[PDB]
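Risk mitigation, structural track. In case the binding assays with protoporphyrin IX containing FE fail to produce interpretable data, a predicted complex structure has been prepared as a fallback.
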Amino acid sequence: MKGTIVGTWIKTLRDLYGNDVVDESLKSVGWEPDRVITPLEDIDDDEVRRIFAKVSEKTGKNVNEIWREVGRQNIKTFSEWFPSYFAGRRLVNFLMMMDEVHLQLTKMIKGATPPRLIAKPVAKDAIEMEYVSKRKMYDYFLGLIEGSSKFFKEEISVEEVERGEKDGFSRLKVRIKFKNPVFEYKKN
Ligand code: HEM
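Fallback model:
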């Protein structure tokens, strides 16, 4: 996992559960207080899982519920760390650029494995979006969508069309319907 993104998760975990829960969890995996993670660092996914496993133990919350809450809250964290990705956009632009963002924010990393997040318009008021990743972070993905709706103040409904693993890839396809239409037909 890109170290910067792990850094956003650490800040979000403090916002959600408190500095004590986080500081202790980080020290149980051997980090010294307070590690600063660099733009080029890579945190091993097994460490992330161990950090979140300790958060689950101390909060009494199941790790899926943690990831869902982290997904919702990390949009606010992203808006402070990556402000140009939010300003001057609406919810549907933001969602539809995510697949390219994740390709190119990891394109410089050797053996990179970004989630695919391909979105496609299917109606004037709806897109389909498919999470595809070997990491099976379904609740984080869904929380990020719900937090994106909150940040942009645009009402959506999310229909989870299908969720399952194939060839080692976890996939979750959602249909996102906007209360107010977001597309018009235009020239190719
Ligand atoms: C808003 C600014 C965002 C930035 C800068 C960003 C960037 C990143 C980066 C660099 C990673 C690490 C990829 C890797 O290490 O392989 C990541 C993880 C992830 N991103 Fe984002 N992302 C953003 C928003 C979103 C949104 C809106 C979604 C979903 C609609 C999303 C879905 C995910 C998921 C699910 C992961 C977990 C990794 C996995 O499942 O394989 N991200 N993000």
